[PDB]
């Protein structure tokens, strides 16, 4: 779940 | 908010 957080900050 | 969710899921 970081990971998908981390990516979807970037994905805005 | 990148940083916060670093942090939040450091905190746990």
Same mark, same amino acid.
């Given at each position: %779940? $970081?990971? +998908? +957080? $981390? $990516?979807? %900050? $970037? +994905?805005?």
């Amino acid at each position: %779940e $970081l990971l +998908k +957080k $981390l $990516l979807e %900050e $970037l +994905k805005g």
